Amino acid sequence: PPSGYGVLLATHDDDTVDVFTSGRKMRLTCSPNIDAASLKKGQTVRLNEALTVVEAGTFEAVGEISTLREILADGHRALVVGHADEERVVWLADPLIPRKLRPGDSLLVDTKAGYAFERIPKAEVEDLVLEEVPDVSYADIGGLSRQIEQIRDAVELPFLHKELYREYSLRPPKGVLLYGPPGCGKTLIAKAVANSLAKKMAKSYFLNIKGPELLNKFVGETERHIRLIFQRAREKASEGTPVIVFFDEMDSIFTTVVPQLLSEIDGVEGLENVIVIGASNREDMIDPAILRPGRLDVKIKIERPDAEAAQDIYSKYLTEFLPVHADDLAEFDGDRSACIKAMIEKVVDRMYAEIDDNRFLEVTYANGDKEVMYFKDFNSGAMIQNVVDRAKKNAIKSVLETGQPGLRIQHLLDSIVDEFAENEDLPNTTNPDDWARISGKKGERIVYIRTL
Amino acid sequence: PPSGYGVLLATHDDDTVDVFTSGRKMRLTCSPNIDAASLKKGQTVRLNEALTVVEAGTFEAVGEISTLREILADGHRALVVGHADEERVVWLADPLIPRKLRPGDSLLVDTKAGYAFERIPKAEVEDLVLEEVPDVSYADIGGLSRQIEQIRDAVELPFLHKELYREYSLRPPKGVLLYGPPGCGKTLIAKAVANSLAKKMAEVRKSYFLNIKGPELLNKFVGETERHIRLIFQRAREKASEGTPVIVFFDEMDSIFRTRGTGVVETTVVPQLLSEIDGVEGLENVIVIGASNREDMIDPAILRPGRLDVKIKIERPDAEAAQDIYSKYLTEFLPVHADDLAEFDGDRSACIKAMIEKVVDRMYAEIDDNRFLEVTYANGDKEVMYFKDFNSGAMIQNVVDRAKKNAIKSVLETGQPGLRIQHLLDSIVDEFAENEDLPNTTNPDDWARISGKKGERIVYIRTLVT
Amino acid sequence: GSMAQEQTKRGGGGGDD
Ligand SMILES: Nc1ncnc2c1ncn2[C@@H]1O[C@H](COP(=O)(O)OP(=O)(O)OP(=O)(O)O)[C@@H](O)[C@H]1O
Ligand SMILES: Nc1ncnc2c1ncn2[C@@H]1O[C@H](COP(=O)(O)OP(=O)(O)OP(=O)(O)O)[C@@H](O)[C@H]1O
Ligand SMILES: [Mg+2]
Ligand SMILES: [Mg+2]
């Protein structure tokens, strides 16, 4: 006996039920074999040529997939959206009408019958990370002891005395903006302060968010991403550890997403544990709306030029594990540590000397005054890393040609000369943190700059 | 004799089977000849007018091709995504449930039937963007040794000596940019690198050197623009997992990945490119090289230590570089008129070297006719520019081509075979006068260099002509 | 900073039925 199928729609007291069959709804009788009371909403039933429901099957396992939007007040209907961004109200099946369905879940549905039968499991990885543990301690930075004390007073101090700060009738600041030259780190400070906060709170969640990747310009979708990020931040704030939301290169952003971000930050205003920290290369490109007193109240400037910090960074980069030439140790009788320290001192003095090789900038002032900037200025950790890598490349060349291993002074000198020849360019030495720095240093405005 | 068809779905204890036929899902009883035990899910069956399973077929090889996303927990259903993101759960066929099933595979599927039957592999994307360039080697490039040495260090050395790099804990350069005035030989360096990579791969024994122009990876549809770059990077990662070096060449990076602020989708390509480059940094064999005339128009974000750590500038050739280029072009195999051989006793090499020296001296001399532009400064005195300040390898090649054309004209008219020195001598003045009116030779980089040298902004330029 | 007009470029959309 060839038998068809249909979808049960409603159950009535007259032992006649509505069935969606062949794409149309029909009121049809039920055979005595099946019990009308036992039947459930959305259950798949079987019929015959005489159109009699002989038995009930199982809820369908295939069909369209829709994203849930909301649930109707009656509790029996739910508004969902399909792949074509079309919104439809579908009656929830018996197993669906703990777990309570929430907006954003994917549901199996047949639009012809308009019934949602099952909830499909989903796996998300982008939002699942939720945890990054920085490994950069304060030992990774050098010549910044005053800055470290300042940031301890800025962020570490209020947390140790939250009760006193609150009873002193002053609201705490929750926003720290680290600004400075792009070449300098300005981000490892965030790792260091996160580590210090984790150590002092006595595992620690540090959320790094990149500005360029957050851009979902197409249709206001970056606002959705920001809302989801702040919701996850609140979720982590439920757990009893401070949560830091870090933004990198905020100048990539900012009528726009600024009001959405401001509202989201105001949402987490009551979260004392959660601190929003941002790092932006372009101070001027920062929207003043976020620069008002309040949320991003704390602003800290990082300054690159100093001899002691550069020497400490160079010492940090040149670890003991690097091979050292036998001729270098001949003057020190195998005392590798002293030889390396002397090498660092010599290369730092060569870099931070005022000679003809340090004619990096020939800057002319408006009144007609001229000055020469040496290799001491425009020095940052990134360029020191470049110097170290170039010196390693030159040392590999020397090993592959002469045969004797080790790192020599001429390698460092050649690396410095080559990297300053390459970096002697306007795009990397652009307007930010340069014109203002020299204006504050010399004391006069500058209208034109010449290079060599 | 006329019999229909249907798709089997499942078997039941009552020897009845579910069949999908003409959009109708039914339950049918098989014929006594056909045993329901041997039947399997997804197999096509033959029906009749009485709707009786009279024969069992095979799995059909037609329908939509969809991308597999995941396998459901039961192990018999899979969630896949269609062409227009029509995500759907479909039962897997018996052959599907070595090769094991993996996410991202292309599967045959009928949405009406709701079943997936077979897997079809497609990995020909790299062949679409594959570009082959033979007949170029580092020997052909003349006047560029420092840049050639640097690019060899940035590509050849890390792959040749991995142990040395791991010994000193030095990260191999991941991004190399080439920039300079037009015609200085950036594309020549790129194609020489491609040919060397092809030679190395043939020695190992090609497709690994992928080359793409900017505007190539732009699509009119709202989607599929990210998909192209995603597939490119996945193919690059697969080639890296093969172990051979792979180089992706973004030619003319001014078209795309420019600065974000300038505008009047280009907004989304650069961020996902940065994400992909950061995610591929683990693979040592993936190297991204891009050439650009307008280095300033590119976003400074990518031009940072890290992704694009290595920058190379190719400047206009000087006298010695011009001599090297002429030596590369003026070979001894070209015919030479007996007049020039008479003074050198038939020694082709010495005669050609002397001719090259003479022509280089001619085209680099500060003669009156070689004055090209009159730079005007607000305060300082005006400056006279020469043709030597805008020299390029392309100009030298065109001069040689014009001289050869004049030689062909001579051998056609007077019948005297060979190449005369006067051919080069007057081709020089012809080429110089041809580009006199056009200030096209000037570039923003050239103007920046000139402004930084004299110390005043350029105010006016005048084309000197007699 | 002269004010300037604009000309947009449409992106094709995929629609079935
Ligand atoms: N103590 C230090 N001070 C400065 N720079 C350092 C220090 N230690 C390491 N660096 C180097 O500085 C480089 C850049 O660091 P970082 O990414 O924090 O700078 P950034 O300002 O974020 O750059 P961008 O804004 O372009 O992303 C790193 O590659 C790192 O190797
Ligand atoms: N050593 C050399 N230096 C410069 N040009 C050369 C050299 N040898 C040959 N040429 C010639 O220069 C011409 C242009 O070279 P190429 O195509 O590399 O420039 P390009 O990188 O395309 O410049 P752009 O990208 O600005 O157009 C080639 O046709 C080649 O024949
Ligand atoms: Mg930073
Ligand atoms: Mg080119």
Side-chain angles (χ1 to χ4, degrees), chain A residues 99-125:
Chain A
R99 293 191 172 188
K100 171 185 176 180
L101 285 313
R102 281 177 166 83
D105 304 2
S106 292
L107 307 179
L108 181 70
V109 64
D110 184 8
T111 63
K112 303 302 180 180
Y115 278 171
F117 301 94
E118 199 194 83
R119 189 268 176 181
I120 303 301
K122 295 162 289 299
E124 275 68 82
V125 62

PDB file of all heavy atoms in Angstrom, chain A residues 99-125:
ATOM      1  N   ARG A  99      16.314  23.307  27.951  1.00  0.00           N
ATOM      2  CA  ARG A  99      17.012  24.568  27.703  1.00  0.00           C
ATOM      3  C   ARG A  99      16.107  25.571  26.998  1.00  0.00           C
ATOM      4  O   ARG A  99      15.399  25.226  26.051  1.00  0.00           O
ATOM      5  CB  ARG A  99      18.276  24.333  26.871  1.00  0.00           C
ATOM      6  CG  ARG A  99      19.358  23.534  27.581  1.00  0.00           C
ATOM      7  CD  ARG A  99      20.668  23.576  26.809  1.00  0.00           C
ATOM      8  NE  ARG A  99      21.767  22.977  27.562  1.00  0.00           N
ATOM      9  CZ  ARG A  99      23.041  23.019  27.185  1.00  0.00           C
ATOM     10  NH1 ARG A  99      23.384  23.635  26.062  1.00  0.00           N
ATOM     11  NH2 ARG A  99      23.975  22.447  27.933  1.00  0.00           N
ATOM     12  N   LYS A 100      16.129  26.816  27.470  1.00  0.00           N
ATOM     13  CA  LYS A 100      15.387  27.890  26.826  1.00  0.00           C
ATOM     14  C   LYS A 100      16.150  28.397  25.609  1.00  0.00           C
ATOM     15  O   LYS A 100      17.358  28.642  25.678  1.00  0.00           O
ATOM     16  CB  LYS A 100      15.141  29.036  27.807  1.00  0.00           C
ATOM     17  CG  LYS A 100      14.569  30.289  27.157  1.00  0.00           C
ATOM     18  CD  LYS A 100      14.463  31.433  28.153  1.00  0.00           C
ATOM     19  CE  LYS A 100      13.978  32.709  27.483  1.00  0.00           C
ATOM     20  NZ  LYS A 100      13.864  33.830  28.456  1.00  0.00           N
ATOM     21  N   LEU A 101      15.441  28.548  24.494  1.00  0.00           N
ATOM     22  CA  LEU A 101      16.053  29.094  23.292  1.00  0.00           C
ATOM     23  C   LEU A 101      16.292  30.590  23.455  1.00  0.00           C
ATOM     24  O   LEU A 101      15.501  31.299  24.085  1.00  0.00           O
ATOM     25  CB  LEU A 101      15.172  28.828  22.071  1.00  0.00           C
ATOM     26  CG  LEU A 101      15.148  27.403  21.508  1.00  0.00           C
ATOM     27  CD1 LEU A 101      16.563  26.863  21.362  1.00  0.00           C
ATOM     28  CD2 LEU A 101      14.285  26.465  22.350  1.00  0.00           C
ATOM     29  N   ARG A 102      17.394  31.066  22.887  1.00  0.00           N
ATOM     30  CA  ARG A 102      17.778  32.465  22.946  1.00  0.00           C
ATOM     31  C   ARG A 102      18.046  32.981  21.542  1.00  0.00           C
ATOM     32  O   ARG A 102      18.366  32.198  20.641  1.00  0.00           O
ATOM     33  CB  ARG A 102      19.032  32.660  23.812  1.00  0.00           C
ATOM     34  CG  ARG A 102      18.762  32.655  25.305  1.00  0.00           C
ATOM     35  CD  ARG A 102      20.053  32.787  26.097  1.00  0.00           C
ATOM     36  NE  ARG A 102      19.803  33.105  27.500  1.00  0.00           N
ATOM     37  CZ  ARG A 102      19.499  32.204  28.428  1.00  0.00           C
ATOM     38  NH1 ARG A 102      19.401  30.923  28.103  1.00  0.00           N
ATOM     39  NH2 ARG A 102      19.290  32.585  29.679  1.00  0.00           N
ATOM     40  N   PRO A 103      17.906  34.288  21.321  1.00  0.00           N
ATOM     41  CA  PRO A 103      18.227  34.847  20.002  1.00  0.00           C
ATOM     42  C   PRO A 103      19.672  34.563  19.619  1.00  0.00           C
ATOM     43  O   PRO A 103      20.579  34.620  20.451  1.00  0.00           O
ATOM     44  CB  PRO A 103      17.975  36.347  20.182  1.00  0.00           C
ATOM     45  CG  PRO A 103      16.973  36.424  21.285  1.00  0.00           C
ATOM     46  CD  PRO A 103      17.315  35.298  22.219  1.00  0.00           C
ATOM     47  N   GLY A 104      19.876  34.258  18.339  1.00  0.00           N
ATOM     48  CA  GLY A 104      21.173  33.873  17.831  1.00  0.00           C
ATOM     49  C   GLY A 104      21.362  32.384  17.638  1.00  0.00           C
ATOM     50  O   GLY A 104      22.350  31.977  17.014  1.00  0.00           O
ATOM     51  N   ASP A 105      20.453  31.561  18.154  1.00  0.00           N
ATOM     52  CA  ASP A 105      20.543  30.122  17.951  1.00  0.00           C
ATOM     53  C   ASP A 105      19.999  29.735  16.578  1.00  0.00           C
ATOM     54  O   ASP A 105      19.110  30.390  16.027  1.00  0.00           O
ATOM     55  CB  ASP A 105      19.781  29.382  19.048  1.00  0.00           C
ATOM     56  CG  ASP A 105      20.256  29.757  20.438  1.00  0.00           C
ATOM     57  OD1 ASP A 105      21.147  30.625  20.549  1.00  0.00           O
ATOM     58  OD2 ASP A 105      19.739  29.183  21.420  1.00  0.00           O
ATOM     59  N   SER A 106      20.542  28.653  16.027  1.00  0.00           N
ATOM     60  CA  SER A 106      20.138  28.151  14.719  1.00  0.00           C
ATOM     61  C   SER A 106      19.115  27.035  14.887  1.00  0.00           C
ATOM     62  O   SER A 106      19.325  26.101  15.670  1.00  0.00           O
ATOM     63  CB  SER A 106      21.348  27.650  13.930  1.00  0.00           C
ATOM     64  OG  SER A 106      22.196  28.725  13.566  1.00  0.00           O
ATOM     65  N   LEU A 107      18.016  27.133  14.145  1.00  0.00           N
ATOM     66  CA  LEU A 107      16.907  26.200  14.259  1.00  0.00           C
ATOM     67  C   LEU A 107      16.578  25.613  12.895  1.00  0.00           C
ATOM     68  O   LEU A 107      16.553  26.326  11.886  1.00  0.00           O
ATOM     69  CB  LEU A 107      15.664  26.884  14.840  1.00  0.00           C
ATOM     70  CG  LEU A 107      15.854  27.639  16.157  1.00  0.00           C
ATOM     71  CD1 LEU A 107      14.551  28.285  16.597  1.00  0.00           C
ATOM     72  CD2 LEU A 107      16.381  26.706  17.229  1.00  0.00           C
ATOM     73  N   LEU A 108      16.336  24.305  12.878  1.00  0.00           N
ATOM     74  CA  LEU A 108      15.827  23.643  11.687  1.00  0.00           C
ATOM     75  C   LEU A 108      14.365  24.014  11.483  1.00  0.00           C
ATOM     76  O   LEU A 108      13.573  23.995  12.430  1.00  0.00           O
ATOM     77  CB  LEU A 108      15.975  22.129  11.823  1.00  0.00           C
ATOM     78  CG  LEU A 108      15.504  21.287  10.638  1.00  0.00           C
ATOM     79  CD1 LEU A 108      16.446  21.467   9.464  1.00  0.00           C
ATOM     80  CD2 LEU A 108      15.398  19.823  11.027  1.00  0.00           C
ATOM     81  N   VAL A 109      14.003  24.352  10.247  1.00  0.00           N
ATOM     82  CA  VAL A 109      12.664  24.832   9.938  1.00  0.00           C
ATOM     83  C   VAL A 109      12.329  24.472   8.498  1.00  0.00           C
ATOM     84  O   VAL A 109      13.207  24.407   7.632  1.00  0.00           O
ATOM     85  CB  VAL A 109      12.549  26.356  10.182  1.00  0.00           C
ATOM     86  CG1 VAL A 109      13.470  27.117   9.243  1.00  0.00           C
ATOM     87  CG2 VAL A 109      11.110  26.829  10.037  1.00  0.00           C
ATOM     88  N   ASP A 110      11.045  24.211   8.253  1.00  0.00           N
ATOM     89  CA  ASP A 110      10.498  24.040   6.911  1.00  0.00           C
ATOM     90  C   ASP A 110       9.523  25.187   6.671  1.00  0.00           C
ATOM     91  O   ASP A 110       8.456  25.241   7.292  1.00  0.00           O
ATOM     92  CB  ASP A 110       9.811  22.683   6.765  1.00  0.00           C
ATOM     93  CG  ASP A 110       9.315  22.422   5.354  1.00  0.00           C
ATOM     94  OD1 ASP A 110       9.638  23.217   4.447  1.00  0.00           O
ATOM     95  OD2 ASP A 110       8.599  21.419   5.152  1.00  0.00           O
ATOM     96  N   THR A 111       9.893  26.105   5.773  1.00  0.00           N
ATOM     97  CA  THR A 111       9.093  27.310   5.571  1.00  0.00           C
ATOM     98  C   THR A 111       7.707  26.990   5.026  1.00  0.00           C
ATOM     99  O   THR A 111       6.758  27.742   5.274  1.00  0.00           O
ATOM    100  CB  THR A 111       9.820  28.272   4.633  1.00  0.00           C
ATOM    101  OG1 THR A 111       9.974  27.660   3.347  1.00  0.00           O
ATOM    102  CG2 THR A 111      11.193  28.616   5.190  1.00  0.00           C
ATOM    103  N   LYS A 112       7.571  25.893   4.280  1.00  0.00           N
ATOM    104  CA  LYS A 112       6.264  25.511   3.757  1.00  0.00           C
ATOM    105  C   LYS A 112       5.292  25.198   4.888  1.00  0.00           C
ATOM    106  O   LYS A 112       4.134  25.628   4.869  1.00  0.00           O
ATOM    107  CB  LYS A 112       6.408  24.315   2.817  1.00  0.00           C
ATOM    108  CG  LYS A 112       7.360  24.557   1.660  1.00  0.00           C
ATOM    109  CD  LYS A 112       6.920  25.751   0.833  1.00  0.00           C
ATOM    110  CE  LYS A 112       7.873  26.008  -0.321  1.00  0.00           C
ATOM    111  NZ  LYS A 112       7.449  27.182  -1.131  1.00  0.00           N
ATOM    112  N   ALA A 113       5.751  24.447   5.888  1.00  0.00           N
ATOM    113  CA  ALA A 113       4.938  24.158   7.061  1.00  0.00           C
ATOM    114  C   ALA A 113       5.087  25.205   8.153  1.00  0.00           C
ATOM    115  O   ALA A 113       4.208  25.311   9.017  1.00  0.00           O
ATOM    116  CB  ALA A 113       5.295  22.779   7.626  1.00  0.00           C
ATOM    117  N   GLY A 114       6.169  25.978   8.131  1.00  0.00           N
ATOM    118  CA  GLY A 114       6.374  27.024   9.121  1.00  0.00           C
ATOM    119  C   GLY A 114       6.543  26.514  10.534  1.00  0.00           C
ATOM    120  O   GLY A 114       6.031  27.127  11.478  1.00  0.00           O
ATOM    121  N   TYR A 115       7.255  25.402  10.705  1.00  0.00           N
ATOM    122  CA  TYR A 115       7.520  24.822  12.013  1.00  0.00           C
ATOM    123  C   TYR A 115       9.019  24.659  12.219  1.00  0.00           C
ATOM    124  O   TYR A 115       9.727  24.176  11.331  1.00  0.00           O
ATOM    125  CB  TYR A 115       6.834  23.460  12.176  1.00  0.00           C
ATOM    126  CG  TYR A 115       5.373  23.529  12.559  1.00  0.00           C
ATOM    127  CD1 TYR A 115       4.585  22.388  12.562  1.00  0.00           C
ATOM    128  CD2 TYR A 115       4.785  24.731  12.928  1.00  0.00           C
ATOM    129  CE1 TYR A 115       3.250  22.443  12.915  1.00  0.00           C
ATOM    130  CE2 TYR A 115       3.453  24.794  13.278  1.00  0.00           C
ATOM    131  CZ  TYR A 115       2.692  23.650  13.272  1.00  0.00           C
ATOM    132  OH  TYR A 115       1.366  23.718  13.625  1.00  0.00           O
ATOM    133  N   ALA A 116       9.492  25.050  13.399  1.00  0.00           N
ATOM    134  CA  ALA A 116      10.876  24.842  13.802  1.00  0.00           C
ATOM    135  C   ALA A 116      10.940  23.588  14.664  1.00  0.00           C
ATOM    136  O   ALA A 116      10.302  23.525  15.720  1.00  0.00           O
ATOM    137  CB  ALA A 116      11.417  26.053  14.562  1.00  0.00           C
ATOM    138  N   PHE A 117      11.707  22.595  14.216  1.00  0.00           N
ATOM    139  CA  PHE A 117      11.691  21.267  14.817  1.00  0.00           C
ATOM    140  C   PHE A 117      12.834  21.020  15.791  1.00  0.00           C
ATOM    141  O   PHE A 117      12.643  20.328  16.794  1.00  0.00           O
ATOM    142  CB  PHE A 117      11.727  20.192  13.725  1.00  0.00           C
ATOM    143  CG  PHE A 117      10.583  20.272  12.757  1.00  0.00           C
ATOM    144  CD1 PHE A 117      10.708  20.974  11.570  1.00  0.00           C
ATOM    145  CD2 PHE A 117       9.383  19.637  13.029  1.00  0.00           C
ATOM    146  CE1 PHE A 117       9.657  21.046  10.676  1.00  0.00           C
ATOM    147  CE2 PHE A 117       8.329  19.706  12.138  1.00  0.00           C
ATOM    148  CZ  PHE A 117       8.467  20.412  10.961  1.00  0.00           C
ATOM    149  N   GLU A 118      14.021  21.561  15.527  1.00  0.00           N
ATOM    150  CA  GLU A 118      15.194  21.205  16.309  1.00  0.00           C
ATOM    151  C   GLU A 118      16.128  22.402  16.396  1.00  0.00           C
ATOM    152  O   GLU A 118      16.074  23.317  15.570  1.00  0.00           O
ATOM    153  CB  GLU A 118      15.922  20.003  15.691  1.00  0.00           C
ATOM    154  CG  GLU A 118      16.869  19.270  16.626  1.00  0.00           C
ATOM    155  CD  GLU A 118      17.800  18.329  15.885  1.00  0.00           C
ATOM    156  OE1 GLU A 118      18.839  18.801  15.379  1.00  0.00           O
ATOM    157  OE2 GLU A 118      17.486  17.124  15.800  1.00  0.00           O
ATOM    158  N   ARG A 119      16.989  22.385  17.408  1.00  0.00           N
ATOM    159  CA  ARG A 119      18.050  23.372  17.561  1.00  0.00           C
ATOM    160  C   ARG A 119      19.366  22.723  17.151  1.00  0.00           C
ATOM    161  O   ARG A 119      19.740  21.678  17.691  1.00  0.00           O
ATOM    162  CB  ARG A 119      18.113  23.886  19.000  1.00  0.00           C
ATOM    163  CG  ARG A 119      19.036  25.081  19.211  1.00  0.00           C
ATOM    164  CD  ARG A 119      20.440  24.655  19.613  1.00  0.00           C
ATOM    165  NE  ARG A 119      21.348  25.793  19.725  1.00  0.00           N
ATOM    166  CZ  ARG A 119      22.634  25.692  20.041  1.00  0.00           C
ATOM    167  NH1 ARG A 119      23.169  24.503  20.279  1.00  0.00           N
ATOM    168  NH2 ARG A 119      23.387  26.781  20.118  1.00  0.00           N
ATOM    169  N   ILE A 120      20.063  23.340  16.202  1.00  0.00           N
ATOM    170  CA  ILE A 120      21.292  22.771  15.659  1.00  0.00           C
ATOM    171  C   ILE A 120      22.489  23.273  16.457  1.00  0.00           C
ATOM    172  O   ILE A 120      22.650  24.490  16.631  1.00  0.00           O
ATOM    173  CB  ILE A 120      21.449  23.104  14.168  1.00  0.00           C
ATOM    174  CG1 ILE A 120      20.233  22.609  13.383  1.00  0.00           C
ATOM    175  CG2 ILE A 120      22.724  22.487  13.621  1.00  0.00           C
ATOM    176  CD1 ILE A 120      19.992  21.121  13.503  1.00  0.00           C
ATOM    177  N   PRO A 121      23.340  22.385  16.966  1.00  0.00           N
ATOM    178  CA  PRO A 121      24.535  22.838  17.684  1.00  0.00           C
ATOM    179  C   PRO A 121      25.490  23.582  16.764  1.00  0.00           C
ATOM    180  O   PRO A 121      25.579  23.309  15.564  1.00  0.00           O
ATOM    181  CB  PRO A 121      25.159  21.534  18.195  1.00  0.00           C
ATOM    182  CG  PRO A 121      24.651  20.485  17.259  1.00  0.00           C
ATOM    183  CD  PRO A 121      23.265  20.917  16.882  1.00  0.00           C
ATOM    184  N   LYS A 122      26.210  24.536  17.347  1.00  0.00           N
ATOM    185  CA  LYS A 122      27.141  25.376  16.612  1.00  0.00           C
ATOM    186  C   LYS A 122      28.451  25.486  17.377  1.00  0.00           C
ATOM    187  O   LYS A 122      28.484  25.367  18.605  1.00  0.00           O
ATOM    188  CB  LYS A 122      26.559  26.774  16.373  1.00  0.00           C
ATOM    189  CG  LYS A 122      25.340  26.789  15.468  1.00  0.00           C
ATOM    190  CD  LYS A 122      24.564  28.089  15.605  1.00  0.00           C
ATOM    191  CE  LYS A 122      23.843  28.163  16.941  1.00  0.00           C
ATOM    192  NZ  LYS A 122      22.862  27.055  17.094  1.00  0.00           N
ATOM    193  N   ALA A 123      29.534  25.712  16.636  1.00  0.00           N
ATOM    194  CA  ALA A 123      30.865  25.869  17.212  1.00  0.00           C
ATOM    195  C   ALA A 123      31.459  27.182  16.728  1.00  0.00           C
ATOM    196  O   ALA A 123      31.586  27.399  15.519  1.00  0.00           O
ATOM    197  CB  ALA A 123      31.776  24.699  16.834  1.00  0.00           C
ATOM    198  N   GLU A 124      31.827  28.048  17.668  1.00  0.00           N
ATOM    199  CA  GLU A 124      32.438  29.335  17.365  1.00  0.00           C
ATOM    200  C   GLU A 124      33.830  29.376  17.973  1.00  0.00           C
ATOM    201  O   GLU A 124      34.013  29.011  19.139  1.00  0.00           O
ATOM    202  CB  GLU A 124      31.591  30.495  17.899  1.00  0.00           C
ATOM    203  CG  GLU A 124      30.461  30.952  16.977  1.00  0.00           C
ATOM    204  CD  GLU A 124      29.359  29.920  16.824  1.00  0.00           C
ATOM    205  OE1 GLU A 124      28.480  29.854  17.709  1.00  0.00           O
ATOM    206  OE2 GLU A 124      29.371  29.177  15.822  1.00  0.00           O
ATOM    207  N   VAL A 125      34.810  29.814  17.182  1.00  0.00           N
ATOM    208  CA  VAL A 125      36.189  29.879  17.633  1.00  0.00           C
ATOM    209  C   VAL A 125      36.673  31.313  17.842  1.00  0.00           C
ATOM    210  O   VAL A 125      37.487  31.551  18.742  1.00  0.00           O
ATOM    211  CB  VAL A 125      37.116  29.124  16.654  1.00  0.00           C
ATOM    212  CG1 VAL A 125      37.083  29.763  15.272  1.00  0.00           C
ATOM    213  CG2 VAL A 125      38.539  29.061  17.194  1.00  0.00           C
TER     214      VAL A 125
END
